Specification:
- Chain A: It is found in: Cytoplasm; Membrane, Clathrin-coated pit; Cell junction, Focal adhesion; Cell projection, Axon.
- Chain A: Belongs to the acetyltransferase ATAT1 family.
- Chain A: This is Alpha-tubulin N-acetyltransferase 1.
- It is classed as transferase.
- The complex is a heterodimer of chains A (184) and B (184).
- By secondary structure, chain A is α+β, with helices and mostly antiparallel strands.
- Chain A has five helices and nine strands, in the order βαβααβββββαβαβ.
- The radius of gyration of chain A is 17 Å and the shape is globular.
- The N and C termini of chain B lie far apart (41 Å).
- Chain B is of the alpha+beta class.
- In chain B, a hairpin with a 5-residue loop joins β4 and β5.
- Chain B has one domain: Gcn5-related N-acetyltransferase (GNAT) (Aminopeptidase), CATH 3.40.630.30.
- Helices cover 30% and strands 24% of the residues of chain B.
- Classes of the chains: A alpha+beta (184), B alpha+beta (184).
- The structure holds acetyl coenzyme *A (2 copies) and sodium ion (2 copies).
Chain lengths: 184, 184
């Protein structure tokens, strides 16, 4: 039904979408609340890894505390958690079809999960659209870290994103990423 | 929910679990028309299963079925609630000649029943459907769980096999199939 936790998620996350950074700050004891948030991030990371068939999580409280990632968490309004998306700027070398490496630092989509029970009901788009508005980035400016097959379809459906230059580094970028690509 | 199709699934598959092989025989319109419906169902299930396990391509399809010794057990929705019927998921199995290391790393030529592909629609995962389907297959195949080899098990599947059949400790292999203590 969702990710259920043995504590008052509503009290902790009063908003439907909660944005947290490396500080994992409780929305306005400090210690007990913050521990609850770390548990949520740990469990979300595990669930996302099971979903994408990863042998280990790529998102955790520990990894959040030591990076400059931003996580957007979607709460179930029916007290449980429905899913999240994690983003961050990363220094990448991107190939440009003259086959040269270009050092860039785009916003990257790093991890993304919606509970199986409510996948394909528009919640992924809900979070993605919120993140786009908050980060003030256009979808074609993004790089995606190891997109899943579901995510590739999602990006093409909602944002008309079509891959551009194939990459060797497991990031994916789309038409519009390069300066000469700006068709409306 | 479930997987829906532009034809009457309940008429095509009268039974809760339908077992099909390379012949793609309609269960007890024209014959070829019903076979086309079956092929469509197998193709679509294969694609869904690949998306579910984050595979870059389907490992199950009508054409692949027709040219192999694989057997598919397809579970239809039997709910009293949902008008053309719906498919919940499937499991595909086949005997394969394998060379498996035992617990002394000695090589053993075996031909176990292998679990090759397995998928339950996301909307109803974790509701016991996979267990029902797995158990039906074991009974019809007359195989015990520890006697199975698993092709490239996903993380969800490893948890599933431990929970339901107490299959947890593996005997390490060099070849991407997985077997459990007790196989020998
Ligand atoms: C960089 C990364 O994070 S890679 C990891 C991405 N995460 C995963 O793959 C985990 C499993 N999947 C999920 O958690 C979700 O499906 C997400 C996050 C990929 C998408 O969120 P949803 O809530 O499922 O998407 P939403 O309902 O908003 O959009 C639906 C669209 O996504 C795509 N999509 C979602 N599920 C599927 C599916 N099972 N098969 C194919 N495409 C799918 C389709 O384009 C679909 O549109 P359609 O129904 O018209 O075909
Ligand atoms: C050889 C191959 O086929 S590898 C590919 C296997 N297929 C996939 O990974 C595709 C996606 N997953 C699925 O289609 C299904 O989850 C299956 C086929 C693995 C299992 O079917 P379900 O109908 O989900 O199983 P069922 O409800 O019968 O059993 C539940 C158990 O499976 C495991 N399981 C199911 N979903 C999850 C999950 N999201 N995270 C961790 N474990 C899970 C758990 O052990 C769970 O028991 P629990 O709820 O007490 O923890
Ligand atoms: Na999933
Ligand atoms: Na899945």
């Amino acid at each position: 039904a969702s990710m259920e936790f043995p504590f008052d998620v509503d009290a902790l996350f009063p908003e439907r979408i909660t944005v947290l950074d490396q500080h994992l700050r409780p929305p306005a004891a400090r210690v007990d609340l913050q521990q609850q948030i770390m548990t949520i991030i740990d469990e979300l990371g595990k669930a996302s890894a099971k979903a994408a068939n990863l042998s280990a999580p790529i998102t955790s409280a520990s990894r959040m505390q030591s990076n400059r990632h931003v996580v957007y968490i979607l709460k179930d309004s029916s007290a449980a958690i429905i899913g999240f998306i994690k983003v961050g700027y990363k220094k990448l070398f991107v190939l440009d079809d003259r086959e040269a490496h270009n050092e860039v630092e785009p916003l990257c989509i790093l991890d993304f999960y919606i509970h199986e029970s409510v996948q394909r009901h528009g919640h992924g788009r809900e979070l993605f659209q919120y993140m786009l508005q908050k980060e003030r980035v256009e979808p074609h400016q993004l790089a995606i870290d190891r997109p899943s097959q579901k995510l590739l379809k999602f990006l093409n459906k909602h944002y008309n994103l079509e891959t551009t230059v194939p990459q060797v580094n497991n990031f994916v970028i789309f038409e519009g990423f390069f300066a000469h690509q700006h068709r409306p």
